[PDB]
């Protein structure tokens, strides 16, 4: 192993439901109040305090582990580009990674970017979900290319504005997500996530060197493969069934959520987010 990275006192997080700590709930309440066509309350009733889980997301745990404050810009459903899985959102706000970066940089209020803040990026799953659910035409190899390009451009744009420090999370293992299994889409997920996770770290390594950035890459796939191969070691029992079923309809939650991998058909439990946040904190000194 190499030396731990310097401590972190401020995180700015950009991403999707795997990071959101209340933005989709705030924003959808605003959209409902304004009467925006097609709006829905997200995430819904069977979720903890606006998180798309039964507890804090991995980046919230990472912030606690590192002794950092967290500004969490992530929005449930966010894609790697400008917009969201929920297309009805775009009329009100661009909540994809690109839109989160735009809003972050447009709300500095004449102040510089903090060159010591960790810019945390965790996105791409909705690129895939949207493609599969609404028959995107791009072959999956092209979709992966566009996800990679979008994330690289976000880092470039953040660095351009003064950001120096980044943690970029890989694709998660979309191939074991309950909704993907139910969709019979395991192979498609495998192919998409391997293409993103092969190309993205190569692109970020080039950019890190060019622009003199500190950029950590977190391999969420390696992380989840290790949990799922040795579940008892982590106190996990159920790897496949959602604790809180929502498809086709909501049913009562399991009694033992801390022994479940998945909360609903797409999102991990608070326990898995805890292990993920701890894992992500491993490259940094407290």
Automatic annotation (TrEMBL):
GO terms for molecular function: cholinesterase activity. The keyword Cell cycle does not apply. Pfam families: Lipase_GDSL. PROSITE patterns: PROKAR_LIPOPROTEIN. SUPFAM superfamilies: SGNH hydrolase (SSF52266). InterPro entries: GDSL (IPR001087), GDSL_Est/Lipase (IPR051058), SGNH_hydro_sf (IPR036514). Keywords: Hydrolase, Signal. The keyword Signal applies. Disulfide bonds join 243-254. This is ChoE.
């Amino acid at each position: 192993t190499s030396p731990l990275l310097a401590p972190v006192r401020q995180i700015h997080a950009f991403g999707d439901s795997y990071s959101d700590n209340g933005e989709s709930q705030r924003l959808t309440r605003e959209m409902l109040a304004k009467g925006i066509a097609g709006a829905q309350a997200l995430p819904g009733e069977v979720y903890w305090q606006g998180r798309w889980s039964n507890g804090p997301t991995a980046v919230e745990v990472l912030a606690r582990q590192l002794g950092a404050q967290l500004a969490d810009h992530a929005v449930g459903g966010a894609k790697s580009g400008a917009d969201n899985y929920y297309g009805w959102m775009s009329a009100y706000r661009h909540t994809g990674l690109a839109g989160q970066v735009d809003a972050y940089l447009a709300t500095l209020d004449g102040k510089p970017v903090d060159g010591q803040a960790l810019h945390f990026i965790f996105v791409s799953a909705n690129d895939f979900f949207e493609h599969e659910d609404f028959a995107g035409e791009q072959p999956l190899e092209q979709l992966a290319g566009s996800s990679v390009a979008n994330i690289r451009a976000a880092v470039q744009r953040l660095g351009e504005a003064g950001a120096r420090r980044f943690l970029v999370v890989s694709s998660t293992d979309l191939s074991v997500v309950p909704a993907v299994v139910a969709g019979n889409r395991v192979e498609r997920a495998q192919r998409y996530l391997q293409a993103v996770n092969a190309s993205l770290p190569i692109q970020l390594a080039a950019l890190r060197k060019t622009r003199g950035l500190e950029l950590s890459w977190f391999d969420h796939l390696t992380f989840s493969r290790h949990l799922r191969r040795n579940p008892a070691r982590y106190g996990l029992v159920e790897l496949d069934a959602p604790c809180q079923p929502t498809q086709p309809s909501v049913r009562p939650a399991c009694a033992n959520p801390d022994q479940y991998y998945f909360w609903d058909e797409w999102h991990p439990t608070r326990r898995v987010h805890q292990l993920a946040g701890e894992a992500m904190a491993a490259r940094y000194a407290r």
